[PDB]
């Protein structure tokens, strides 16, 4: 009946998701399970293989010129985050009605939204023992990240913890497309001017998301409910991630935070 419009919305979203996010979950799982027979990611478990993997992973983003491993890794991670924000922003623009919102609200939705979305983006690249890096060329182990000195050793663990739980829901790119749109259009962000048009758009997206999950996962029940409860946990979890980054900005003089990242962590919670 009106389901057709929700299916249309879900596809519109999946199509723009594909355009906005070059490395999809499908590709990441393919690489992580070896389904594709491109040459495996170079595994990095320690300082030595970090060094040896340099041909494939290419940590040459320090181009004024280097430093201890923890800083070089963090800046590698930081680099990709900046691009992630560029991607989430382009994807937001494709969500119907979003660019008609007040530009202050557009900014505010993204400011709070990106972090929650990045956690979901990392999950796609993750298993219980590590994360894909360099567009699937490399794989950094969870043990190696943990073993780094403070404050950097605990930076990725919360994402690993979340990723284990989140990936068990076994969502794909077509589910994730709509799920990301829902997060972005939360009308309970601090400092929003016009809540009503945000909530109107989000109404549709949750209807679209509910339908998608029934059709695409009919065997799996209360997935919609499971998924919303994760989404609320995610908001809770991001409040710690922000605090660790304040410390790194204020303590670590060797490096510095990319201005964009300074905008999205500035004046938050």
């Amino acid at each position: 009946p009106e389901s057709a419009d929700l299916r249309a919305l879900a596809k519109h979203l999946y199509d723009s998701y594909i355009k906005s996010f070059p490395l999809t979950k499908a590709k990441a799982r393919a690489i992580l399970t070896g389904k594709t027979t491109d040459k495996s990611p170079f595994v990095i478990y320690d300082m030595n293989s970090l060094m040896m993997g340099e041909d494939k992973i290419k940590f040459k983003h320090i181009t004024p010129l280097s430093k201890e491993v923890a800083i070089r890794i963090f800046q590698g991670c930081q680099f990709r985050s900046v691009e992630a924000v560029q991607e989430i922003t382009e994807y937001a623009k494709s969500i119907p009605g979003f660019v008609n919102l007040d530009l202050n609200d557009q900014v505010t939705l993204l400011k709070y939204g990106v972090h929650e979305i990045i956690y979901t983006m990392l999950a796609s690249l993750m298993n219980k023992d590590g994360v894909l890096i360099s567009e699937g060329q490399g794989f950094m182990t969870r043990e190696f990240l943990k073993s780094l000195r403070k404050p950097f050793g605990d930076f990725m663990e919360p994402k690993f913890e979340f990723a284990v739980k989140f990936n068990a829901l076994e969502l794909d790119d077509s589910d994730l497309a709509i799920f990301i749109a829902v997060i972005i259009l939360s009308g309970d962000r601090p400092g929003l001017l016009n809540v009503k048009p945000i909530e109107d758009i989000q109404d549709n997206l949750l209807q679209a998301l509910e339908l998608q999950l029934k059709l695409n996962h009919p065997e799996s029940s209360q997935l919609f409910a499971k998924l919303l409860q994760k989404m609320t946990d995610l908001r809770q979890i991001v409040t710690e991630h922000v605090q660790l980054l304040q410390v790194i900005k204020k303590t670590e003089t060797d490096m510095s935070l990319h201005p964009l990242l300074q905008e999205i962590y500035k004046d938050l919670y």
Partner: peptide
Amino acid sequence: HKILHRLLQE
């Protein structure tokens, strides 16, 4: 939020 503003308008 100069950059964020700029990404949204461009």
